[model samples]
Target: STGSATTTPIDSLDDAYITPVQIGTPAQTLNLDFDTGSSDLWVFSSETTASEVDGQTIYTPSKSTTAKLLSGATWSISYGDGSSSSGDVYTDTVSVGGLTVTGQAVESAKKVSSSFTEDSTIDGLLGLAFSTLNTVSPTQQKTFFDNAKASLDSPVFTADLGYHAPGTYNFGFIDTTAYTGSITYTAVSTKQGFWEWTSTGYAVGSGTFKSTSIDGIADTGTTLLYLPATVVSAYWAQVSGAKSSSSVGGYVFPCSATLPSFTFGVGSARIVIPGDYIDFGPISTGSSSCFGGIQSSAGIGINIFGDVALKAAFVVFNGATTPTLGFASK
Candidate 1:
């Protein structure tokens, strides 16, 4: 809602987590995550260094009878957290929920860093969100959407996020029967990676961001929304006598009184930020007004709408529909 752009993310994966999504015959299981930032599916492998692969779940080729590994192609990816993994680029028949997808590009990381290795709970990430976004083109990249594009009854896949389930993320088809009203559809921006968009800007209360919307992509991997310092400064200033306490990174307003409801606008679409999300966990000092979710990252190329924002609405991402991507409410 801040400046404006349009996009949605998938889900984040948990440590040592494995779920069997029936994709036709014997369930095809793969480590998945709710990463809203980038849309790429990667998994660790047995070939990785013991230290790197230790405690991490490796999709051992032998374990998946239906899967095959491309010994030649190897790849690695880095994230903001400064964690990375190097793995073999393998090709295989992957499926979820009775949907079988052939020739999917699966990464088999042979070496991972301590950052990821130390996390015992997270086995690996399952990028079911963007069936797109990779160095290779969509045609060449076998992603969740690319493979699942053919089998669905409609050219649609809706994410019914089960946030209440600790460590569980669930998605399903978009049900028109439940709403009965026409859904709002936004045109997808032609972006290389996952479908990221821009927001006009953010308003703390009744105010509106004057500038043209800014661009950002919503992602599940990201824990919080990131905004430019310029935009954030303008926003907090309006929070009914909101004062800046050099003590923290984000802003804080009078809690005794209801602060202005946060509104982020993207073109015509808008999302509201609940107060609880704003006050993540206040600084131990200042009136217990914990640090807000919005953070400062002036140099980053783009803004990000994190999970807290996604909790408020149901988002559907349709990859089967060609030339353009489709979005609507749950």
Candidate 2:
């Protein structure tokens, strides 16, 4: 059940990873939003109200005789931004790359918030997270990975996401050529239904590594890296004109500001995020101030190791008997 696929970032912002998936008997191809943060395989379908969908591709279950509605089954999910969706469930043959999962629960969206309707880049989302996070009521569903794991050569997957470029997502086996050196293994806490782990510490530029414990979730669904306020301030202090401006929202600095490379630890292994990656993009078009990829997670409660951090490392999500995460420099 091993498989591999190239996932491309949305735009210059490297916003979200887009992975094409094959659904139903005839294999209707659709670019789906790939996320490791949540568990629910929902898609915009023909069953959705016409007004609820914009130009995004829709799945037509009627076109596939293999599609069977899971009677009385429903799913409702909400995000931090207050966006939500709810729909009935269906079981269909789903495939990613060459990995196939027969009877994979496909939650066909009957209703979606305004935000979901406008995304032309993605037709649906394929969750790689633990099945406990599945929002289905009456009958829960397993993620694509969870269902495919039993048949895999090894119950593991690797995410080698690129910065401002396309990368690969591999399942069942680790690609030795994709990463350098040995991978540092760390314990993962699935209590929150996330790939939560603790970092040994971090260092700013050439500074000494701080022996601090930073707990965070490795979320590919999120765009930027969010750390504690003190750590963020420390990094910003080194920049000439970096400030947390309310008008622009989040941390912003001069476009030409010299940035310090940020380094975070996975046990004793260190992964360094280049300075240029921190300069997310300009706050406004043609503006001198730019938004930062790394921000404070003070109000957010938990630190997030999003694309900003992920782009710097080759991460392996091991769904072994004893679940663990592996990180290696690329």
Candidate 3:
């Protein structure tokens, strides 16, 4: 049967989207961040440090009849922003929406960094990237989607992330009614275990579309649009009072600045991000300064089409023999 899940933005800040997932036979539910950039299904659990628990709901393997420990197996992951989690491994029946997969790897957290502890609400991460990126040691694990793909009518999923609202993620089937117009697809390179694609070019505001090619990963976990240093500088130059802020680790400007919209060419379509969306809330709540939603991919070798870019379009992640990415106006 076709499966689907509802994705909801935590708030207007739009850092990440959360979806409910069930693990183990008894069906313990967790609010997981469905991150397409990473590949590992890990959660806060009984093994987690007591002080680090916070308000997160931990997964208990003992409560599920089907939960089995993978002795000597472990999993760990570190994010670009320095957030991290590490834990022991367990095999259980995991389900997303109505799609169930037995013998699924479930990493139970034994330790989590402060970055994760503070979030409180994010109980785990449901990684949908290529299985080659899974972090479990001894034997790498397969994601829920990878394990269930063989049985699906179609190996596909669509991410309809809305701005400050709830969206839907469809698996094994594309809901045509969720998007407008036709989908423009581009071949993707899964070499790096990511949905990496190249953009023909980009432009600032309504300016002419340049012909420079940019190689990047489409990441739903990341909050901002990260492009090459030169591209980021060019966009900032057009804004008044915009400067690189040491405090924020990116460019920041006055909240009232007249920002220009940013556009990127994918295949034959040009997906445009509104100027208002560029103003990522105040640097600090109640502060007059705001951070630019687009930043430089300096140290990170690859550019990233994060939430800021994904929210502007309806994205389809095709898992067929030749994986591809399809986009259309939301």
Candidate 4:
């Protein structure tokens, strides 16, 4: 019992990775962002206000015979900026590739913030984070991967995100052909309900390797790689004209400036992110300055190894009794 699905980058900046998910008895297919940073399998639904839903797909539980409303269940996820989504819950048949969870809790949105309403590329998100992070009230719910892990040949899943290309997420077993080199393993900290791990060190392209510990989470939902301010400054120093911009809201550099690669360690293994991946893209259409894919995480508290880093290697999200992360260069 294993499954595989393709995750397509939504925009030129590789903003979000959207994957197809089949829900309900009749299987209403929708493109969902598989987020490892959160724990909720939410979707736009008939329950949501029409004004809040743009050109995104909506799930209608009443249209599926296998759907069962989880009475009294409600959930709300909010961001610090005051935007949020709240809704009722339902359990139904949910499938991804060749795997199926017979009664997966599917949160149906009744209200969503403007940000969600504007992102027509994805209908909602399917969180792969630990079940402890699930927001269902009165009764907690399990993520799709959690409910399907037991039946999987191996209690693991892998994320293979790509730069401006479609990637694949495989469940149950690792496909050696999908990656190169031996996988480097490290213990994962589930205390925060995240796929958190400590990196051994880091080095700017062809620069000195710093053998210090850096703790961060592998977040597929996030778009950039965020590290300590010291590390970010070191990398940017190598570029000809790069600076932190208040107007741009992040680090921006001359579009033609040469970008260097970034490397981080897992045990004795090193995963390198290509220079082009760090270039990100222009700040806006026709702009001469571009935004960087790597930034400082000083304010965020925790470093994040997001799509910019994950796409540089094959990442294994192990879900054993004692979970561990595996990184392999490809």
In terms of lDDT, the best-performing candidate is 4
Candidate 4 lDDT over 141-221, as tens digits, reads: 999999998999999999999889999999999999999979999999999999999999999999988999999999998
What TM-score does model 2 achieve against the real structure? 0.97
lDDT of 2 by residue, 166-265 (tens): 9999999999999999999999999999999999999999998998999999888888899999999999988988899887779999998878999999
Clash-forming residue pairs, model 4: none
Candidate 4: 10-residue stretch with minimal lDDT: 77-86
lDDT by residue for model 1 (63-111), tens: 5666665645656667765777666666676655545566677766677
Model 2 CA deviation exceeding 4 Å by range: none
Candidate 1 lDDT for residue 116:
72
TM-score of each: 0.74, 0.97, 0.97, 0.98
Predicted candidate 2, C-alpha RMSD: 1.2
User: Per-residue lDDT for 158 in model 1?
Assistant: 48
Winner on TM-score between 1 and 2 is 2
Q: Alpha carbon lDDT of residue 42, candidate 1?
A: 70
- Report the CA-based lDDT of candidate 3 relative to the real structure: 0.90
How do the residues 1-330 of candidate 3 rate in per-residue lDDT, one tens digit apiece? 568999888767788889989898789999999888999999999999999999999899999999999999999899888889998999999888798899999999999999899988799999989999999998998988888888887999888888888888888888888778889999899999999999989999978889888999989989899999899999999999999997789999988898999999898788989887787878887999888999999998889999999989889999999999999986
Off by over 4 Å in 1: 1-31, 53-55, 128-132, 135-140, 162-172, 177-182, 206-211, 238-260, 266-269, 282-289, 320-330
- Total backbone collisions for each predicted model: 51, 0, 0, 0
